[PDB]
Design a protein around this ligand. Structure first.
Ligand SMILES: Nc1ncnc2c1ncn2[C@@H]1O[C@H](COP(=O)(O)OP(=O)(O)O)[C@@H](O)[C@H]1O
Ligand SMILES: [Mg+2]
Lengths: 370, 316
């Protein structure tokens, strides 16, 4: 078999090509212990990865080696890929070709070092590195659409028409689940809930995943929260002490619609999809408006497909119908699209081969990946 | 006392006496309670048989919220026809008691607890219906918002339990909310009561009591009660809201939670009274400080020596 790895900024998804879901889903995290260590023989370990780092997190400095969709610590990403193959997926990468996955408008060197480590450290027979959002079209059984993809590190838009992408209309936004977690720590502080450590960052990520949703009309939910008894929710922390939050539940995701909440001068995700459609050729726009695909875990907020359908129908002309394709599986649709692409019967000529890398070096990736 | 008892102390002591007594005497005892409630305790046909009867101005509303079913479940075979001028009644026969001192004690407790048992039925209706909505929301989390929106109006209880308090409550899949539409008509208690209601809501914002029900306060009504008949936004009422979450009415805690929420405004009223005794001791302590500023105007003179009764003494 081939293997499919989606190198998420927050969360690794990994599995075999032709499977219907990832075999392994785990935190894109390396943990180093920050306290001294006093019990010899009791199974201390110099660093921890994934679910083990997430499980022992109280004594650890957790670090994400991907941020804003680029690898910023390659030594820790070699640990995450080693953990992916040998510990989590139980495979030798020496004999399976790997589909990797990458955000658009990344640094060229991110593509190069990612192909180099696969051939020169993991010895893979062949590899590829697909654009993250065109896989989410494959997962939906579809050759035309504009896809909003938002994971933990980046939000990006790719318009694609009849299997051809419009690369000048692609646009990227360095705001997704990480920034929404940081802004939830910022605004939990005003209820009196100080979260400060990179272990408490993960508690706030869980409060975000359990309690947050997006308002269909922000000023109407802000007015509803002025009589808050319906919007207040309690959450219990690991220590069994509890927090209760109200408008923090929808002020957090509204940063996607109003990036100025985190002081960021950019259009929201609704206006960025509209600006990406209006960058495309005039006769294709009708079919992109009808095919707004939503993907990645930052698209999982309750109310976000309705808020997106509303706020794009307020920008676009009323003469054509707009609908948001937000599957319930959409956290994994990037990986599902890679499972399709890596098993698809005309893709086997498109792999970067080991000999084909050995002839050219890591620059080979730019002349056949995209 | 820092906290009020939940039960009627007279009924508890009287039944704890008569359930032990070798020779019961007759009784004819009307007994008042808080919130305009009243009891009659008597031996109307034999010294052997005690009739306990409750009078309560909101009892017809409480019957609409399943009160007779709960009172039949609690008092069982002891339930009796209502006495004239009373809403509910129980007959206990002193030769028909349980076989143990501990069963007798919890029966004397159960009958003294009768005002909070008649008033508990709307809270048990909210807690048991929240468990239905919780199971339906656990079945389909995307249908739950519509179940909560309809239960906010179709499963709302209002009790006009005294002429200056309406308790309003409803279930939603993760909570019971209860609003006290609350007022003090006596003007010094309205002035001290503003301080009590303000510091009550600010207490819940501190780290030490985040484990408590969420509390909110205003003086217009919470959105979901604004059109309940007898709520009125200009009529000097404040509105204390408690959001009980699933952890506040867990099976180990339901009955203490019910007992303790019903007594909310009674503890506040009692402490507005007891604060005056505190202010009066605060005052007379610094009347005694101002004495020492006048005592320095007394010129120093030795008084003649006197015995303890004040009679003059002739030595030294
Ligand atoms: N139910 C959810 N509601 C809101 N945010 C979610 C939800 N589930 C996951 N997330 C967010 O999505 C992130 C992971 O999404 P994912 O698509 O896997 O991102 P990535 O591939 O870039 O790592 C989480 O770290 C969190 O910020
Ligand atoms: Mg991602």
């Amino acid at each position: 078999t081939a293997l499919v790895c989606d190198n998420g900024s927050g969360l690794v998804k990994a599995g075999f090509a032709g499977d219907d879901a990832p075999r392994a889903v785990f935190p894109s995290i390396v943990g180093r212990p920050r306290h001294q260590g006093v019990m010899v023989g009791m199974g201390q370990k110099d660093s921890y990865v994934g679910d083990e780092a997430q499980s022992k997190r109280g004594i650890l400095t957790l670090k994400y080696p991907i941020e804003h969709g680029i690898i910023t610590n390659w030594d820790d990403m070699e640990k995450i890929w080693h953990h992916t193959f040998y510990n989590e997926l139980r495979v030798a990468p020496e004999e399976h070709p790997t589909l990797l996955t990458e955000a658009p408008l990344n640094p060229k060197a991110n593509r190069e070092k990612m192909t180099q480590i696969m051939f020169e450290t993991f010895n893979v027979p062949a590899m590829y590195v697909a654009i993250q959002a065109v896989l989410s079209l494959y997962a939906s059984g579809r050759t035309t659409g504009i896809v909003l993809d938002s994971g933990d590190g980046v939000t990006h838009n790719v318009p694609i028409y009849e299997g051809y992408a419009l690369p000048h209309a692609i646009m990227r936004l360095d705001l997704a689940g990480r920034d929404l977690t940081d802004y939830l720590m910022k605004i939990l502080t005003e209820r009196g809930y100080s979260f400060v450590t990179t272990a408490e960052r993960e508690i706030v990520r869980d409060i975000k995943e359990k309690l947050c949703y997006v308002a269909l009309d922000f000023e109407n939910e802000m007015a509803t929260a002025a009589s808050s008894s319906s919007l207040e929710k309690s959450y219990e922390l690991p220590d069994g002490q509890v927090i209760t939050i109200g408008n923090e539940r929808f002020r957090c995701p509204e940063t996607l619609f109003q990036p100025s909440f985190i002081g960021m001068e950019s259009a929201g995700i609704h206006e960025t999809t509209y600006n990406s459609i209006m960058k495309c050729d005039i006769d294709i726009r009708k079919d992109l408006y009808a095919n707004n695909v939503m993907s990645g875990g930052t698209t999982m907020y309750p109310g976000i497909a309705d808020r997106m359908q509303k706020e794009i129908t307020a920008l676009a002309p009323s003469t054509m119908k707009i609908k948001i394709i937000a599957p319930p599986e959409r956290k994994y649709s990037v990986w599902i699209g890679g499972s399709i692409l890596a098993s698809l019967s005309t893709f086997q000529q498109m792999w970067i081969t080991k000999q084909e890398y050995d002839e050219a070096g890591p620059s080979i990736v730019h002349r056949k990946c995209f | 006392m820092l906290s009020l008892d939940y039960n009627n102390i007279f009924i508890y002591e009287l039944l704890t006496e008569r359930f032990s007594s070798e020779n019961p005497s007759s009784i004819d005892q009307v007994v008042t309670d808080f919130d305009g409630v009243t009891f009659h305790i008597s031996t109307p046909e034999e010294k052997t048989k005690i009739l306990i009867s409750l009078s309560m101005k909101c009892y017809p509303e409480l019957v609409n919220y399943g009160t007779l079913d709960l009172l039949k479940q609690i008092y069982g075979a002891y339930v009796h026809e209502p006495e004239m001028g009373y809403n509910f009644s129980i007959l206990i026969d002193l030769q028909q008691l349980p076989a143990t001192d501990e069963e007798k004690e919890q029966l004397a407790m159960s009958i003294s607890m009768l005002k909070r048992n008649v008033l508990a039925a709307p809270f048990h209706r909210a807690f048991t219906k929240q468990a239905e909505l919780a199971d339906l929301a656990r079945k389909d989390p995307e249908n739950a918002p519509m179940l909560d929106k309809q239960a906010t109006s179709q499963e709302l209880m209002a009790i006009h339990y005294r002429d200056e308090e309406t308790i309003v409550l409803w279930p939603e899949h993760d909570r019971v909310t209860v609003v006290f539409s609350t007022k003090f008509r006596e003007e010094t208690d309205r002035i001290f009561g503003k301080v009590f209601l303000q510091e009550f809501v600010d207490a819940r914002r501190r780290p030490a009591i985040q484990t408590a029900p969420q509390v909110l306060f205003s003086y217009d009504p919470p959105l979901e009660i604004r059109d309940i008949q007898g709520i009125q936004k200009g009529d000097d009422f404040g509105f204390v809201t408690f959001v009980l979450f699933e952890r506040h009415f867990t099976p180990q805690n339901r009955e203490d939670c019910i007992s303790h929420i019903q007594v909310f405004r009674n503890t506040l009223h009692f402490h507005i009274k007891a604060s005056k005794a505190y202010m009066h001791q605060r005052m007379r302590k610094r009347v005694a400080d101002f004495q020492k500023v006048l005592n320095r105007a007394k010129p120093d003179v030795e008084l003649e020596r006197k015995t303890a009764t004040g009679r003059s003494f002739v030595r030294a």
